[PDB]
Amino acid sequence: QVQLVESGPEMRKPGESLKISCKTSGYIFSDYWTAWVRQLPGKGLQWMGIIYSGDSDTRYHPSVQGHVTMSTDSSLTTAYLQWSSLKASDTGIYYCARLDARVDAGWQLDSWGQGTLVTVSSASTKGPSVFPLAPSSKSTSGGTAALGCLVKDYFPEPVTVSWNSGALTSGVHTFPAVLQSSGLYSLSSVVTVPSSSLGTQTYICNVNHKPSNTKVDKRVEPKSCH
Amino acid sequence: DIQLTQSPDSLAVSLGERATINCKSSQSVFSRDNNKNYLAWYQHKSGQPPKLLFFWASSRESGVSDRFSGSGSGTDFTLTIDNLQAEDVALYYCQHYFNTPHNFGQGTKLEIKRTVAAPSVFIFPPSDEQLKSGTASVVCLLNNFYPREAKVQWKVDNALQSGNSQESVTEQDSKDSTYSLSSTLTLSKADYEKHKVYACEVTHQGLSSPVTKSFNRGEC
């Protein structure tokens, strides 16, 4: 069906070039524009502009003109956003979204990409260390056990956490990362489960940090005494 | 260049009640040629891409709940959510597409009010793996509480700590409208092994006294 799929997260140094992509499928590319939208810190969306693949006709927001460039590959039904010389303040989430080009149509954005976190920093990329938060009598009460993973010392954002390859979602809390004094991020992901089934169920946190090409699966087992 | 300004910036509304979010356009976005307002509303939930709700100010996108409605024209617009549900917790944006640029409003944060719920508290000593690396993180979890205002204090051998912890709170849950909070006390392995009792002490309006969760280092 109708889909817009963006590149994974990207990490670059200031001054470097970058082109992110938005692969569209499920609809006729030539019947639509493609818009790029930037998410602002805290709250807010900035309409950056649009591009029609038919003749590469472009509108830009007057305050993004000339710093970013939109293009398309109609053959690949894909739209691009490009910086020739990144600045650290370009960091943030960028969405693509489709817009009806037809006569008749309003120019609302009815389908959206998942967003791409672009980070621009002179600091070094670093993959996380992943440590178990083991269920024990100190995290078990009322029939409920809490367990989780500590994801420590990574850069940049984002780190992705799933549990049991996505089969475990209810009761999961993956906390917003904190910025340590070291300039590295840390977060935790926790889940509450029945304490009765700790002996029969298996809990694995799957940790992904694409900027460092790091993937960690950590089995989280109940604490025992040795 | 036409700008949109939303009111309020933030709104906290009880489950079952009505939520009203307003959008004021700096110029009219009503066309006498087409008899249409060039306006849309979007929902943006945590961790999801933005979703189209209305266009032409009042025309409802397919699959959007009948509890939602868009009204207004010219320069004043309203998004109304009746019978507020837990899953409505989100940021809401208006956008015009009258001319270029197709600007969005600054966003309105819709928060849900629910009954008071005290946190369940859990504590995690550091893993043996991490201890091998030379550092010790102690984690305290405050699960599923409301309202958001909760306090955590660390005590090590009954001495109040300062300067060695960080905390983070979740966004509001889309199912039970609660929050959770994680706090981490971090020490060197050396400092960690100089003490025995590690305690997390929790205050919340849902509790009449502070709740303490603790463990003794080394006790299996």
Residue numbers in the entry:
A (entry chain H): 1 to 52, 52A, 53 to 82, 82A, 82B, 82C, 83 to 100, 100A, ...
B (entry chain L): 1 to 27, 27A, 27B, 27C, 27D, 27E, 27F, 28 to 214
What wording appears in the published article?
By binding to the region that is critical for the aggregation of tau and which forms the core of PHFs, CBTAU-27.1 prevents aggregation of tau in vitro. Furthermore, the epitope of CBTAU-27.1 is specific for tau, and is not present on MAP2, a microtubule stabilizing protein closely related to tau.
